[PDB]
């Protein structure tokens, strides 16, 4: 058999390992940071890309392909960057790059397109991998060498617009996060030194793993601004004559998710998988003749016909205590057991993933008692989260609060005035307070949009200065 | 005001590419080989992905992401391959390489994954890019240094089993280019030579491109047989206990497929995109004042109640006209005109991409008529395509009725002994004549395309039409891209 030993609660490290392995998630590959995305891992991408794909196709935006490659000189305009530089045994003129992200691969090709503001919006994106090559210790899903994201790169003729689709976007990755995947994610402001590199805003939505007590990024979104229009010369015409810069937003959102979305949800019997991106809602495990097994397809199509997903495991060689196991570590939210007994019945016994609860349904109300079943399967999965992130974030008022809150495993919510250099001056003095595999230093996360009410007079909970607004704080990835 | 000047039948060359330039269909890159897959040739990409995925998910093969570099000890296991080496300014410990294909990258975990008869058969399929670092001459779509793909890699117990899966990939193929892009292939058999490497037997489609002769192979499904499994030690355990080798399949399909397409449909206006596949299927230009945009958008509404892709071209900045070609460079099957004078009378005037002819029609019955539109349109597209395809192709006994067949832009179905130094000999012939033909001209190799299908009855006896061998079948020949 194959199934969960770890305990999630005690070593959070190898339970995620075997969550992800034991349940025909990852594979290894002899390339150190990379890993192989099995079937069933990829069918929760596909849910997830399928849905964020008709939502901003309902935007407006096109789907396109730039090369994977970019020049040396239109790259080195203002690392972790591979290069390639033969092509089987000689030399090539230029050693061309991977794209780490295609800013400066979509952008000459912006500069060329937009002439007037007829041309505007311009609004595309792309579905590719994407390389970033560090030296640190990899991560499955979370960090990974190379990763499967999306990367929508659009450019508007007034800021207002910019901003505006920005916003949109973040509000897509909130209902990616949320809606699909059940996890609650922190709409916020990103902090200056936090920000994307040439940008002029970043927003953010942001997750908490309570288990190591660490924030980690869950998309982005970024108003780049007139920026990058500099540095690429991408500039337009109104109908006056006026050449002026365009205004670029750029947003991604990666694979990490999926990640995110197994420690929010697995248990000490490996995944749970909330019903909407969930690869087979309901598997039909036949307990053993003929009728039985011929009766589990009409229960199949029957189900089938409310736009349910199910598998029916016919597999013969394999214990029905194997199936059961199986599809546990599998995550599958219903499973569905029918019996010789059951089908003399009329009636059919179903097993939730999240709780357990034991079910005994007429075939008649199969299928809408499943929907409902699924429903709340999915709203008490998100909830359970919900109510862990917030008792995971403490509010304070002075410096002297964060230590204990930090070692809590909690995030903290403060007043701050901002400063940038108070940030590095609160990293530097949280690891040296910590020091007493990864830091123990606490940085920013976001500034929340949900902003609580700042009184009447306040003050920075590390500079004493004048507080700005509230900042979520907290050891991060 | 982006037209296509060039003709077709003239200037093939050139018509090509102002046809995929001005329909803003790709954009260039300053590396070469590599082009700018703009969206109006990805909603294409989109829809026959879609396809594909659909059917392939019919027989059970699931989907999957491996990584994009091999090792080198990996891959080298018995070229045009990119190699990373550096990161930032640092060199790194062992030199990985980008993949061309990843036979070599999923088959290790293949390994690792197969134990019993249980846990067969496999099928997976990717959908990635792959870098081909050939230094030759780029050609947009059909021979990119960076081209999209899907490809699928399946194991199985039994070889029947497998190739059975090969020749049911093989049809998917088919049905995408015929009934999806519109564009005839050949089903067919690779030669002992041109087949892939390391496998029992390639099989292929194969399309034909008038304009300068030229076969192209559309798509492939390999029988790799056991040959793989005993380079990276995939065996199972039997139903009995014995240890076996499984039995392996690979296939894929690329974006050339859009290439072909076009080169197949377009005409001396532009493109001609076939409605199964276009991205708007129906463009309705107001003729330009909110009294005609109203009812533009209730009949987009309407149409779309029957699942036509419209977009409404309500930029008022542009005339009229100036749309028309706009929309037929880009080869919008129909297009939708609705003037002030339409709007009394209840009727618009719709004009069809590949023809030309113009039909007058009520709004009531506009959303039907449409369909049998879009339905007659491409049914005619692929019915010319195949009828030219069969223009193409001469059956010939003798190879003194090569030279001629090849002089007409045309291939040839010969019966051959299968002989590979045959073959290699007839190319460098062909080439050492066709060089001599071209001396008095002031500026061509012939080669297997594919042993088709339906292969005609062979008579007893019959001589290679190049050796005098016993002949074995009739192979399709001819210059190749
Ligand atoms: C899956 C994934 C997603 C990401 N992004 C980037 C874009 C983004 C999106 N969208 C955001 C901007 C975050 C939202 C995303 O998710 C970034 C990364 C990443 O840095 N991988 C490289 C890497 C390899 C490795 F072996 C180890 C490390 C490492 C780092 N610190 N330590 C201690 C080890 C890092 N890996
Ligand atoms: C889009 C694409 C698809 C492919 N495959 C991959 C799978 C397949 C499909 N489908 C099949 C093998 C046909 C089944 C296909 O077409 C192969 C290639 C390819 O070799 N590109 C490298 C390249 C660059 C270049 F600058 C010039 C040349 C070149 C070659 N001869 N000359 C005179 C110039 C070649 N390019
Ligand atoms: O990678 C990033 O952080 C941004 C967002 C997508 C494109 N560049
Ligand atoms: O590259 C090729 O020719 C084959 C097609 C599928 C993968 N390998």
């Known amino acids: 058999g194959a199934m969960v030993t770890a305990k999630k609660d005690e ?3 190898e339970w995620y390992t075997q969550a992800i392995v034991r349940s025909e998630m990852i594979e290894y590959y002899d390339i150190s940071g990379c890993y192989i995305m099995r079937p069933w891992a990829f069918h929760i991408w596909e849910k997830v890309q399928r849905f964020f794909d008709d939502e901003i196709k309902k935007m407006g935006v096109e789907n396109s392909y730039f ?15 591979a290069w390639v530089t033969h092509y089987g045994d000689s030399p090539l003129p230029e050693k061309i790059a991977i794209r780490p992200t295609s800013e400066t691969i979509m952008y000459p090709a912006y500069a060329k397109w937009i002439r007037s503001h007829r041309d505007l919006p311009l609004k595309l994106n792309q579905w590719c991998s994407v390389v970033r090559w560090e030296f640190k210790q990899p991560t499955p899903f979370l960090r990974t060498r190379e990763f499967l994201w999306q990367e929508g790169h659009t450019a508007h003729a007034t800021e207002e617009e910019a901003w505006e689709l920005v916003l949109d976007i973040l509000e897509l990755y909130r209902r990616w ?27 953010t939505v942001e997750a908490f793993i309570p288990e190591n007590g660490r924030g ?8 780049l601004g007139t920026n990058f229009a500099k540095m690429f010369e991408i500039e337009f015409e109104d109908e006056e004559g006026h050449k002026r810069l365009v205004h670029q937003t750029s947003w991604g959102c990666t694979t990490r998710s999926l990640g995110v979305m ?11 998988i909330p019903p909407r991106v969930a690869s ?21 199509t029957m189900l089938e016909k409310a736009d349910i997903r199910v598998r029916i495991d016919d597999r013969s060689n394999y214990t029905p205590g194997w199936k059961y196991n199986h599809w546990e570590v599998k995550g599958v ?5 029918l019996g010789p007994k059951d089908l003399a019945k009329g009636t059919a016994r179903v097993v939730r993933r999240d709780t357990g609860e034991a079910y005994q349904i007429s075939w008649a109300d199969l299928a809408p008692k499943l929907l409902e079943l699924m429903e709340g399967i999915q709203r008490s999965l998100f909830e359970k989260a919900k109510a862990r992130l917030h008792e995971g974030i403490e509010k304070i008022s002075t410096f002297d609060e964060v230590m204990p809150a930090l070692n809590r495993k909690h995030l903290v919510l403060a007043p701050w005035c901002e400063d940038p250099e108070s940030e590095e001056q609160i990293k530097k003095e949280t690891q040296k307070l910590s020091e007493i595999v990864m830091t123990g230093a606490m940085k920013t996360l976001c500034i929340p949009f949900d902003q609580p009410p700042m009184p009447e007079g306040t003050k920075c909970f590390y500079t004493g200065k004048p507080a700005k607004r509230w900042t979520l704080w907290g050891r991060s990835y």
């Open 333 to 337: 939210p219903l499973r569905l057991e």
């Open 216 to 223: 980690i990024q869950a998309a982005t979104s970024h108003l």
């Open 280 to 300: 087979v809602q309901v598997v039909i495990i036949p307990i053993l003749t003929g009728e039985i097994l011929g009766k589990c397809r009409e229960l199949k």
């Open 67 to 81: 090369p994977m490659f970019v020049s040396r000189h239109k790259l080195e305009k203002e690392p972790e960057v």
């Open 177 to 203: 996060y949320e809606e699909c995947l059940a996890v609650p994610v922190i709409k916020g402001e990103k902090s200056e030194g936090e920000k994307f590199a040439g940008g002029k805003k970043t927003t």
């Open 262 to 272: 197994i420690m929010t949800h697995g248990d000490d019997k490996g995944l749970v």
């Open 11 to 13: 070593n959070f490290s």
